[PDB]
Symmetry: C2
Subunit: 206 residues, 2 copies
């Protein structure tokens, strides 16, 4: 398998740019608080993302959070909600939608609302990144086999280099988790840890 | 794991609509002809996609083929080509970008050229689908864990119900293949076989 992917030209390292942005994907209570059946254990990974975000905010790099939120009228309109009926609980005005405070989200941090898995689809994220002259995005969040991968794929397609720290990704199952990190490492971006991005961000700032 | 995914609201069946369309993703020679390192065995899946496409074309349902092709100038402009370097061989005018004749492409079938994994990103696919009043898409092609998965996700996000026959999906490795078929069945669409879609297509035309 390793030989198959290497000959097909997968797994090459990405050369990092000099205008980073951090994207925090769906670290809302709906996905991080175990009282809701749609959530995973994200305690460790949220504290890792907190360190990254607190660094980037101090270094004046854009930090953008994303959440899934619906109006009651949108439920029958979106066929994704037929397949994943649990996402229908993610309603405007509810606690499920609010970003988890364990991330260290600051009032001036941009939150983008989305209706699908990918953070770029039907959202303003791409424009925010292009307007700030971003060349590299570090993707963090939940879930790794869900919204994270979908965001990762859409980010590379959109013209941005993708770094993903494994420290920072949470899923509800180990299998899907490893499969996505594998696919990303081969096809879409560099998989690393938080320790690498902390050092890298400091060196790009001077 | 099954209980975790059931509580989260995943795994539900999609109620199929009445305006079908077939999307054939990257069944070009670059992914089907084994003389190339980017390719994988797609013999059986092509002859089953041929069966589906013939029926749909006869019933006058939209049949759409998608392929990846690049201008030589586009190569340095796209960060995905840095990650998946082998995709840079897919140039305009080469044999790798031509749709494999084993699928039975007819001169009236639409070919959409794309620059990424997803058939929807930066392409007219959504406009074609919506313009023909499509409600349900059957997604086929290669690779399962690459462009197929990405197209499936985008299809649901774009407002279309999704059916993927495992019969018509080829990948370079079994692991990634099963892992994407798992995620699709839980989150994005119904994984079925070619025998079911053929039967289903006839009943909608009745």
């Amino acid at each position: 398998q390793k030989e198959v992917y290497d000959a097909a030209g997968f797994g090459n390292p990405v050369s990092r740019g000099v205008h980073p942005a951090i994207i925090v994907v769906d670290f809302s209570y709906g996905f991080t608080d175990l009282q809701y059946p749609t959530a995973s254990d994200a305690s460790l990974q949220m504290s890792r993302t907190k360190e990254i975000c607190d660094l980037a905010r101090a270094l004046e790099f854009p930090v953008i959070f994303t959440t899934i939120a619906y109006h009651p009228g949108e439920i029958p309109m979106l066929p994704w909600l037929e397949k994943s009926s649990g996402m229908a609980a993610l309603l405007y005005g509810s606690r499920l939608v609010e970003i988890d405070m364990a991330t260290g989200i600051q009032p001036n941090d941009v939150v983008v609302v989305k209706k699908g898995a990918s953070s770029f689809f039907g959202s303003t994220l791409s424009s925010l990144l292009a307007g700030t002259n971003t060349d590299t995005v570090v993707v963090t969040g939940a879930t790794t086999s869900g919204a994270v991968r979908a965001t990762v794929v859409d980010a590379v397609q959109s013209g941005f280099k993708v770094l993903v720290p494994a420290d920072c990704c949470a899923d509800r199952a180990k299998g899907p988790h490893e499969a996505s990190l594998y696919d990303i490492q081969q096809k879409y971006g560099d998989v690393t840890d938080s320790d690498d991005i902390l050092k890298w961000l400091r060196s790009v700032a001077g």
